[PDB]
Design an enzyme around this catalytic site. Sequence first.
Site, PDB file in Angstrom:
ATOM      1  N   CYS A  66      -3.732   9.081  -4.666  1.00  0.00           N
ATOM      2  CA  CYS A  66      -4.592   7.954  -4.995  1.00  0.00           C
ATOM      3  C   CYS A  66      -5.335   7.451  -3.763  1.00  0.00           C
ATOM      4  O   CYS A  66      -4.726   7.158  -2.717  1.00  0.00           O
ATOM      5  CB  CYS A  66      -3.736   6.845  -5.590  1.00  0.00           C
ATOM      6  SG  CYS A  66      -4.624   5.415  -6.187  1.00  0.00           S
ATOM      7  N   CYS A 102      -1.128  14.032 -14.467  1.00  0.00           N
ATOM      8  CA  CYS A 102      -1.765  15.059 -13.655  1.00  0.00           C
ATOM      9  C   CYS A 102      -0.783  16.140 -13.214  1.00  0.00           C
ATOM     10  O   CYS A 102      -1.211  17.204 -12.761  1.00  0.00           O
ATOM     11  CB  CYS A 102      -2.408  14.440 -12.419  1.00  0.00           C
ATOM     12  SG  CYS A 102      -3.882  13.499 -12.805  1.00  0.00           S
TER      13      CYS A 102
HETATM   14  N1  LIG Z   1      -7.388  -2.993  -6.758  1.00  0.00           N
HETATM   15  C1  LIG Z   1      -6.656  -2.445  -5.813  1.00  0.00           C
HETATM   16  O1  LIG Z   1      -5.733  -3.034  -5.239  1.00  0.00           O
HETATM   17  C2  LIG Z   1      -6.972  -1.019  -5.509  1.00  0.00           C
HETATM   18  C3  LIG Z   1      -8.088  -0.459  -6.110  1.00  0.00           C
HETATM   19  C4  LIG Z   1      -8.389   0.854  -5.844  1.00  0.00           C
HETATM   20  C5  LIG Z   1      -7.555   1.579  -4.992  1.00  0.00           C
HETATM   21  N2  LIG Z   1      -6.498   0.996  -4.421  1.00  0.00           N
HETATM   22  C6  LIG Z   1      -5.652   1.842  -3.570  1.00  0.00           C
HETATM   23  O2  LIG Z   1      -4.612   2.303  -4.409  1.00  0.00           O
HETATM   24  C7  LIG Z   1      -3.466   2.668  -3.607  1.00  0.00           C
HETATM   25  C8  LIG Z   1      -2.187   2.140  -4.244  1.00  0.00           C
HETATM   26  O3  LIG Z   1      -2.250   0.716  -4.153  1.00  0.00           O
HETATM   27  P1  LIG Z   1      -1.012  -0.185  -4.540  1.00  0.00           P
HETATM   28  O4  LIG Z   1      -1.524  -1.595  -4.480  1.00  0.00           O
HETATM   29  O5  LIG Z   1      -0.315   0.340  -5.739  1.00  0.00           O
HETATM   30  O6  LIG Z   1      -0.046   0.108  -3.263  1.00  0.00           O
HETATM   31  P2  LIG Z   1       0.592  -0.959  -2.237  1.00  0.00           P
HETATM   32  O7  LIG Z   1       1.188  -2.054  -3.063  1.00  0.00           O
HETATM   33  O8  LIG Z   1      -0.399  -1.256  -1.140  1.00  0.00           O
HETATM   34  O9  LIG Z   1       1.819  -0.074  -1.696  1.00  0.00           O
HETATM   35  C9  LIG Z   1       1.694   0.714  -0.522  1.00  0.00           C
HETATM   36  C10 LIG Z   1       2.869   1.667  -0.504  1.00  0.00           C
HETATM   37  O10 LIG Z   1       2.735   2.525   0.616  1.00  0.00           O
HETATM   38  C11 LIG Z   1       3.929   2.456   1.380  1.00  0.00           C
HETATM   39  N3  LIG Z   1       3.695   2.652   2.811  1.00  0.00           N
HETATM   40  C12 LIG Z   1       2.844   1.989   3.606  1.00  0.00           C
HETATM   41  N4  LIG Z   1       2.916   2.403   4.889  1.00  0.00           N
HETATM   42  C13 LIG Z   1       3.882   3.352   4.904  1.00  0.00           C
HETATM   43  C14 LIG Z   1       4.483   4.173   5.947  1.00  0.00           C
HETATM   44  N5  LIG Z   1       4.045   4.107   7.216  1.00  0.00           N
HETATM   45  N6  LIG Z   1       5.438   5.046   5.551  1.00  0.00           N
HETATM   46  C15 LIG Z   1       5.847   5.121   4.277  1.00  0.00           C
HETATM   47  N7  LIG Z   1       5.356   4.400   3.262  1.00  0.00           N
HETATM   48  C16 LIG Z   1       4.387   3.499   3.539  1.00  0.00           C
HETATM   49  C17 LIG Z   1       4.414   1.040   1.136  1.00  0.00           C
HETATM   50  O11 LIG Z   1       5.765   0.925   1.551  1.00  0.00           O
HETATM   51  P3  LIG Z   1       6.395  -0.409   2.192  1.00  0.00           P
HETATM   52  O12 LIG Z   1       6.894  -1.016   0.925  1.00  0.00           O
HETATM   53  O13 LIG Z   1       7.472   0.034   3.160  1.00  0.00           O
HETATM   54  O14 LIG Z   1       5.280  -1.163   2.891  1.00  0.00           O
HETATM   55  C18 LIG Z   1       4.198   0.933  -0.351  1.00  0.00           C
HETATM   56  O15 LIG Z   1       5.191   1.732  -0.996  1.00  0.00           O
HETATM   57  C19 LIG Z   1      -3.728   2.078  -2.226  1.00  0.00           C
HETATM   58  O16 LIG Z   1      -4.169   3.129  -1.350  1.00  0.00           O
HETATM   59  C20 LIG Z   1      -4.871   1.113  -2.480  1.00  0.00           C
HETATM   60  O17 LIG Z   1      -5.743   0.950  -1.361  1.00  0.00           O
HETATM   61  C21 LIG Z   1      -6.170  -0.282  -4.672  1.00  0.00           C
END
Ligand SMILES: NC(=O)c1ccc[n+]([C@@H]2O[C@H](COP(=O)([O-])OP(=O)(O)OC[C@H]3O[C@@H](n4cnc5c(N)ncnc54)[C@H](OP(=O)(O)O)[C@@H]3O)[C@@H](O)[C@H]2O)c1
EC number: 1.5.1.30
Length: 205
Positions: A109, A188
Amino acid sequence: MAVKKIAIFGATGRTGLTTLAQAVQAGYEVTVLVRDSSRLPSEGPRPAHVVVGDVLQAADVDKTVAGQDAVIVLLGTRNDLSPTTVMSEGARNIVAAMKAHGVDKVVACTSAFLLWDPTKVPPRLQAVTDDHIRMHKVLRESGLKYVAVMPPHIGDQPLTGAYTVTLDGRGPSRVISKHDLGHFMLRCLTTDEYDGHSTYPSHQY
Ligand SMILES: NC(=O)c1ccc[n+]([C@@H]2O[C@H](COP(=O)([O-])OP(=O)(O)OC[C@H]3O[C@@H](n4cnc5c(N)ncnc54)[C@H](OP(=O)(O)O)[C@@H]3O)[C@@H](O)[C@H]2O)c1
């Protein structure tokens, strides 16, 4: 329509948690790499294998990719919009591990902003989008079977399983529920038809 096996990166995040839950319920034998296991639900359906480490550390990624049939990537920076290389560094380590172990399938993603006119991406989101672009390039260049999942706004609506999927990739709605997004990540794994494509899941709730 669900399925069974895999490693999830980012399982403690908003989409990760529901993807993990759906994957275990579906029947998958799921490994997670988490920085801190206290962020996994000491309640919800328990992954087969929890590995503690950092996606920036190649050896931790290698351990979590060993023996897997496919890789799901839901890495992100929460609400932190600062410049970052975590996702692109993680992707580089994931690609190296997949190549070494002979794992071919990665569903990862990034964001629908990779499908926008760049002059319209909101400037406040550009630093994160830059690393999404870096991550996407790493995965494209790897030659692995890579589904690029590029969702618009991730909402909190309940799972419908009725969203649309547009290839390469714009798409008519600007929201996808985290639950539907996780459903799609796992879908997927059940088909090759999106490999090498960008996919934009969206729905009107
Ligand atoms: N509307 C939106 O928010 C939106 C829209 C489009 C796309 N996106 C993208 O969609 C993706 C998923 O978003 P989400 O909001 O579901 O995710 P999120 O809540 O930002 O979660 C991030 C995940 O990545 C892990 N992570 C971060 N740094 C890490 C590291 N160094 N090593 C291992 N794990 C790590 C975090 O673990 P920890 O718990 O340890 O931090 C958490 O499990 C993101 O890339 C986001 O930018 C978001």
